[PDB]
Structures are given as structure tokens and as C-alpha cells.
């Protein structure tokens, strides 16, 4: 909170990252640009990030674009951020993503570089009300982005930006692919549409088309019963209701049923609860820790980047706790199939 705490960090020979608490000075051979007011996080409650995949992908495009322009090839590109600690965490998050994804840096190396100036980044909070019981750091986000690359969760060579932005809007179904070709999360569908104003309650019909074309063969409902399962099954969808207390954690019986349904579905699975964030995100994170052996923090990070707001309150503790157990379940699983 003082232009004394200003800091410049080198990313590449031409790219620089700056945290300025004042007016960026200019220069004829330095180009300054900020995304503090360009790629903003749409918060639920006290959460302030991280930014979703779309914005991450947009940022990577802006960097590549700026490094390619003939008008600035002889200039240093400086990505600056201001005095808002939450904006700093996001801008730092984006540079980190760029190093991991396009540069070939490791999560640890990108993190080293980001804290070289001794900058003290505040860690990402959850979307619950009141005190946070768990925090995900920039390093936790870098490992997640890294593994998403290795396992095919992220591919900026094929990522469809307009598709991602179209379907996250409430008026189009508020949905997100968590794992491409395998897991989608969406807002609970209400029996009988109401796509008209103040509301954006979707009936199962605006999902059936998209679902079929992307091979969704299964549907799990964690929400309470707002529609008759029939409306989805009647279209060839296998449906399941693993109901359990809203905002609460799943019993192991439920976690095992979920993993069972999933481990056996024949295509992609669409999961939803009421907001398609908390309960939904919690169970999908479960499948990922067991099958990709990622930490609770890396998983929660990946899931929130795909669908901001996922995993809330006591849900985070649950994942953190169940981690060791899901890691081993997957261990045994992988070997049984061998």
C-alpha cells in the first residue's frame, strides 16, 4: 500500500511482471498493459478468484499477440497490476499459467519467479459465508494447470472459447466441462422451464440436444427432486439420484456409489445439484483424486478454474481428509485392471 512496495519481476527476456502501487512510468521502448479491469472475477461472496479457463486462455492470447506484433518487437512488454491484493493474486495467477502452459516451466519454477521480489500474495478463498476453512495457493494452481496439460484436461490448441463463454451463462444452462469428453457440471434443471427474466430455470430439454452431441450417457442428481427423472431417461439417458444434504458432505456409501456409476458409465457424465457448484464439484473432485492421483488442493483448484465457486465450506475439509483414502483406492483400482 505504498509505491515503495513496487516490484518488477522478469519473466522472459522480453516479458516483465510488475506490481505497482503508483502510476506506471512510461518509456519509448517499454509497453505497459494491465488486465485488472479486463479479466475480472465474478465473485459469489468473499471469493476473489482464481480466474476461469476462458480468461486464462484470453490472457495467453493477449501475451502471444503482443509478443508477435511488428510495432512492438523492439519493446519490453510489461504486465502490471495495482494495489488491490486480490487483483495481484489473479495477475500473478495468469503469468504463472503462461509460464506453465506456453513457456515450458515447472510449477515450482514459475512460483519461484513470482515471489522473487518477496511479494506476499494472499491465497484464494472459498465461496462460503463466514470464515474460510481452506485456502488454495498460486503453487497449488500451477500444479493443477500442469497436470491438466499432462492428462488432457486442458488443450489450448482445441479449446473453444465461444462455446465455453456461451454455456456458462445462466441463460444458456450455466454449464462447464470439468474434464473434456468426460465430466460436465450444470445448474439443477427445474421441472417446467422459466427461461424468462429474473429467472433462468431450465427444463431438461435445453440440455438434451447438447448432451447427445457430446456423448453424455449418464446423469447424476444430488439436488433434491425438482423434476421427474423420466424427462431425461426418456431420451436414452441413464439417470441416478445420489441425494444428500445440501452444502453438506457425502457419506462414503455415496462417494463409492458415485465412483461406481462413473467408473462404469459409457460416455460423459453430467452432474448437477442446485447451483451445480458445491455438491457437484465435491464429487467430481473425488473421481479425479482417485483416478488422476491429484491432491485435494490441486483438484479443487482445477475444478474452480473450470467452474468458479465449486467446493464450499466443509466440502473442502472433506476432500482434504479423504485424499489419502482415494489415492489408495485408485492405486488398488489401477492394479486390479492390470
UniProtKB/Swiss-Prot annotation:
Catalytic activity as recorded in UniProt: O-phospho-L-tyrosyl-[protein] + H2O = L-tyrosyl-[protein] + phosphate; O-phospho-L-seryl-[protein] + H2O = L-seryl-[protein] + phosphate; O-phospho-L-threonyl-[protein] + H2O = L-threonyl-[protein] + phosphate
Q: Say yes or no: keyword ATP-binding present.
A: no
GO MF annotations, alphabetized: protein serine/threonine phosphatase activity; protein tyrosine phosphatase activity
Mind listing the GO biological process terms from this record?
cilium assembly; DNA repair; microtubule cytoskeleton organization; mitotic G2 DNA damage checkpoint signaling; positive regulation of cytokinesis; positive regulation of ubiquitin protein ligase activity; protein dephosphorylation; regulation of exit from mitosis
Supply the enzyme class, top level: hydrolase
Known partners and oligomeric status: Interacts with FZR1/CDH1.
Tell me its family.
Belongs to the protein-tyrosine phosphatase family. Non-receptor class CDC14 subfamily.
- Quote the record's domain comment: Composed of two structurally equivalent A and B domains that adopt a dual specificity protein phosphatase (DSP) fold.
What is the name of the protein in this document?
A: Dual specificity protein phosphatase CDC14B
Please give the organism.
Homo sapiens
Amino acid at each position: 500500500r505504498d509505491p515503495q512496495d513496487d516490484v518488477y519481476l522478469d519473466i522472459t527476456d522480453r516479458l516483465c511482471f510488475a506490481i505497482l502501487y503508483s502510476r506506471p512510468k512510461s518509456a519509448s521502448n517499454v509497453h505497459y498493459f494491465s488486465i485488472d479491469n479486463e479479466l475480472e472475477y465474478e465473485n459469489f461472496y468473499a471469493d476473489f478468484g482464481p480466474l476461469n479457463l476462458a480468461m486464462v486462455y484470453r490472457y495467453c492470447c493477449k501475451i502471444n499477440k503482443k509478443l508477435k506484433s511488428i510495432t512492438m518487437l523492439r519493446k519490453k512488454i510489461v504486465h502490471f497490476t495495482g494495489s488491490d491484493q486480490r487483483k495481484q493474486a489473479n495477475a500473478a495467477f495468469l503469468v504463472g499459467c503462461y509460464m506453465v502452459i506456453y513457456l515450458g516451466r515447472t510449477p515450482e519454477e514459475a512460483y519461484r519467479i513470482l515471489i522473487f521480489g518477496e511479494t506476499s500474495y494472499i491465497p484464494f478463498r472459498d465461496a462460503a459465508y463466514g470464515s474460510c476453512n481452506f485456502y488454495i495457493t498460486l503453487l497449488d494452481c500451477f500444479h493443477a494447470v500442469k497436470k491438466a496439460m499432462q492428462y488432457g484436461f486442458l488443450n489450448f490448441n482445441s479449446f473453444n472459447l465461444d462455446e465455453y463463454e456461451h454455456y456458462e451463462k445462466a441463460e444458456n444452462g450455466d454449464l462447464n466441462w470439468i474434464i473434456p469428453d468426460r465430466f460436465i457440471a450444470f445448474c439443477g434443471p427445474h421441472s417446467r422451464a422459466r427461461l424468462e427474466s429474473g429467472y433462468h430455470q431450465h427444463s431438461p430439454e435445453t440440455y438434451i440436444q447438447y448432451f447427445k452431441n457430446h456423448n453424455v450417457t449418464t446423469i447424476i442428481r444430488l439436488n433434491k427432486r425438482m423434476y421427474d427423472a423420466k424427462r431425461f431417461t426418456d431420451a436414452g439417458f441413464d439417470h441416478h439420484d445420489l441425494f444428500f444434504a445440501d452444502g453438506s458432505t457425502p457419506t462414503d456409501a455415496i462417494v463409492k456409489e458415485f465412483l461406481d456409476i462413473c467408473e462404469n458409465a459409457e460416455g460423459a457424465i453430467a452432474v448437477h445439484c442446485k447451483a451445480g457448484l458445491g455438491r457437484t464439484g465435491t464429487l467430481i473432485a473425488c473421481y479425479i483424486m482417485k483416478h488422476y492421483r491429484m491432491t485435494a488442493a490441486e483438484t479443487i483448484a482445477w475444478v474452480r478454474i473450470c467452474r468458479p465457486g465449486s467446493v464450499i465450506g466443509p466440502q473442502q475439509q472433506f476432500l482434504v481428509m479423504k485424499q489419502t483414502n482415494l489415492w489408495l483406492e485408485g492405486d488398488y483400482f489401477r492394479q486390479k485392471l492390470k
